[PDB]
């Protein structure tokens, strides 16, 4: 029982590390898209106010 | 291995498939490996190295013989989903020392400037039976080929008078270890990850060569991460040695 709990403890550790790492790394793009949207909006706004 | 404690080669393959794109592609991974490590020349090239390191230290230490990067590539291929084996034997020195100032330079084309001239697209003119072509008339190709021969002789004589045949490389010397060297490479067997057939890989230079024309000399045994196969009849060329009857065939 101890050994059978131990190897699954290690497997749980491994999957936890994997999922944490992908969750941490992947989230970097929605910020870029939102910033692009806001910046293009402001650029279109500035010269229209000028007009 | 580096600890000099006895190890089994069959268990020495550690396939590690990192998420990186560069090493996913067998062709691109081989190219990056060729352009990522200066090749360390085997000595003696005719024998087995003092230590056989695992793929981790192989990628860590950035230098080594054929086995190191070869095991690295084969392990990567196995992890990706291809069909990879490691084959070591006898190969020419040109493979080992990484001297190819005479081998074909595939890089000689890149950067080429091609005239995007005014050869316009010859419009899709309708070939109606009403509109006829230009009538052939009596013209002689006899004088035409005479003229072309005269011109070609002109430039041939000019190039001989203005050019010399000193287009001579520095010949690569004979290999004392040639015919008994121990060099290794990665063999792709057809079937896993859409492999057409068996293809031999040059991990030292990232060059691909085939059994029917490969420079490899001997095939004494092949190995993997799971099974080791021996070749009772290595006196023949790699072309006559079936790489798919490895288990069942005698």
């Amino acid at each position: 029982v101890n050994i059978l709990e131990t190897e699954f403890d290690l497997e749980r550790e491994e999957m936890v590390k994997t999922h944490k790492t992908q969750l941490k790394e992947l989230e970097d793009m929605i910020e870029t898209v939102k910033e692009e949207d806001k910046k293009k909006t402001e650029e279109a706004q500035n010269e229209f106010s000028q007009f | 291995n580096e600890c000099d404690v006895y190890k089994f080669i069959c268990t020495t393959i550690r396939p590690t498939k990192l998420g990186f794109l560069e090493l996913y592609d067998y062709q691109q991974c081989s190219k990056y490996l060729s352009e990522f490590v200066q090749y360390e020349e085997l000595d003696p090239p005719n024998e087995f190295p003092l230590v056989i390191p695992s793929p981790t230290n192989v990628a860590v230490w950035q230098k080594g013989d054929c086995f190191d990067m070869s095991i690295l590539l084969c392990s990567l291929l196995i992890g990706v989903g291809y069909d990879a084996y490691c084959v070591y034997g006898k190969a020419p020195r040109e493979i080992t020392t990484r001297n190819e100032s005479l081998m074909e330079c595939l890089f000689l084309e890149k950067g080429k400037y091609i005239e995007e001239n005014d050869k316009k697209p010859k419009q899709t003119l309708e070939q109606n039976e009403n509109a006829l072509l230009k009538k052939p008339i009596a013209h002689s190709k006899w004088d035409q080929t005479q003229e072309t021969k005269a011109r070609e002789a002109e430039e041939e004589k000019r190039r001989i008078a203005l050019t010399i045949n000193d287009d001579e490389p520095d010949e690569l010397l004979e290999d004392p270890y040639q015919g008994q060297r121990v060099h290794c490479w990665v063999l792709l067997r057809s079937g896993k990850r859409d492999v057409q057939q068996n293809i031999f890989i040059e991990p030292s230079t990232g060059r691909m060569y085939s059994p029917s024309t490969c420079p490899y000399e001997c095939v004494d045994a092949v190995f993997n991460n799971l099974n080791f196969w021996i070749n009772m009849k290595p006196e023949c060329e790699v072309k006559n040695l079936n790489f798919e009857e490895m288990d069942s065939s005698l």
């Binding site: 497997e11 491994e14 992908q22 898209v33 | 998420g19 996913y24």
Partner: protein, 52 residues
């Protein structure tokens, strides 16, 4: 389980590169739409101007 993890990672890398492909190509088609719009803007403005 290592092969399972590697396949999951490869599948998500394929999905992520598809995300990047779609994002970039849609941005480029919208840039083309904008380029066409502005070229037409300039032609219309020019002609209307000398007509004015």
């Amino acid at each position: 389980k290592e092969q399972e993890i590697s396949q999951q990672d490869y599948l998500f890398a394929l999905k992520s590169e598809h995300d990047k492909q779609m994002t970039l190509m849609r941005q480029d088609y919208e840039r083309q739409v904008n380029d066409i719009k502005r070229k037409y803007d300039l032609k219309m403005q020019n002609l209307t101007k000398e007509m004015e």
